[PDB]
């Protein structure tokens, strides 16, 4: 029983780049499966390799993911991301197709805490601990709102994607990195995953779910 | 005026299976349109048949839905689900394309209540009443969070999709089935639809919207 | 460095219509890029024209968006909408593919306020001010819930898409238009954008984010 999914984020055009498949398990732990480059070369995450096969068909203009010998373990939502660059670097993510099946070492990134509780205007600080050293220009932060696919929020440790509101910043180097918000705003109620792609295989943090309380209220009418 | 939508969840590969179109009306009442099998055979829901036409093109690797003679009544969001099995059973849903048009018997599943209000840690119990007897291994439960497409939560009455947190269980047989949560968790704030596919045509419940209160608070500072 | 995206909302079938690309910037300001018609003719928004190129391939059954000379400014989420009509008028939107890049006159519609705070059952009233006169049958209202793509809520100023709950209405003419809800309902917690397509180039309002308070509570146990 094989899993076969299609991807088609990019159009015609396109002269290079890297299509990568990524799955998110329930629990939200993100997993980097592998990629296929324009000139045909692929990379599969060792955790599989024997099972996974990424391919493409410029004839149909579709990129495929074949995950042989599936089992309830592969139940997750699958994303297909496209990545290109010179100095300018483009990154777009597909929608996530949710898959459910029935039959019942690297740089590990440690997100903490698993769920930060914040009221509005409050200063917020999230930490990501890398099980080893990671190039500071290959450390990324993604924001994900329930139902949406990951949005590149901060790239190269401290650089804010265009449009990220000023209240955000990104600190770090070597094994300890962090993201902070000068002061909540409820539009920041999401999940933040740190990402590292300097060491193969590429990894993601477990997640911090960020959500704000309501703020105080009183009843001295009174 | 015809409605023409495409689907492409599966990739190359694939040696069988059943692509099925399903629409969700505003109100969230889900509707099972029909399916097309790999070896070419189709099934259309009687409510239409004269209007609907499902087809595929392995050349473009796309599955199509043609719904002739549309009218404001067909305004809904359309999903394309793929279903395969031996003993292992794969099921993945497309994204939902939202359609809006302007011009102004079976086993009916009864969800109840239409909207359960729960605080955290509370025991929760949702009921689904079938207008007739339904095979207990063809009764399914789907969870849908606003904006997302249905996620297979429980299959065969009481079996939890991999990753469904332990606090969930599924009771039932014959005409009365139910789903319960040992104790809320706000991540359970979604909609739960029961599904039956033992009797043609296949049907879905109306929906229960599940959402939690906040929990108590006090002000004895004091 | 060019941006190349694909679209495939429509299926085979289809005898005309207009595929249009629209981007939404972080901040949510919506932007109308252009369209391509079935018989091949295109229209590009003047803000670009030199950069944008819309095309299609009936061979692959895909519609493309090529946005040459990208820069962090084009970071947004891109939608592909399909529009057809005789008297019956079909409109469906794609999913939004989120794009992020790194390198650091018309009828302007003014949404107000940028964020209305409402408790349940309350009468709500949102206003849209057009920098000039707009045909009242080319003024539209879209609802967007975080993570979802715009849903056509009201068309031709005052006509409710099928399924829009009765509590909604749409007032206006000439330069001032408005949308109202007879009484909240928390399922109305979304964003509402007014849209005008009588004058080229077509425009969208900035957005009003609509969200309800909780309602009062007391503690006289007591
Ligand atoms: Ni109180």
Author numbering:
A (entry chain H), B (entry chain H), C (entry chain H): 16 to 237
Report text from the authors:
A single chain antibody fragment (scFv6H4) was made from a high affinity antibody that is one-sixth the size of the parent IgG and was shown to rapidly decrease METH serum concentrations within a minute of intravenous administration in rats. ScFv6H4 is comprised of two main domains – the variable heavy chain domain (VH) and the variable light chain domain (VL) both with the characteristic immunoglobulin fold. The present study was undertaken to extend our understanding of this therapeutic scFv by solving the structures of the empty site anti-METH scFv6H4, as well as in complex with two important active metabolites of METH, amphetamine and p-OH-METH. Although the antibody was raised using a METH-like hapten, it binds to its metabolites AMP and p-OH-METH also.
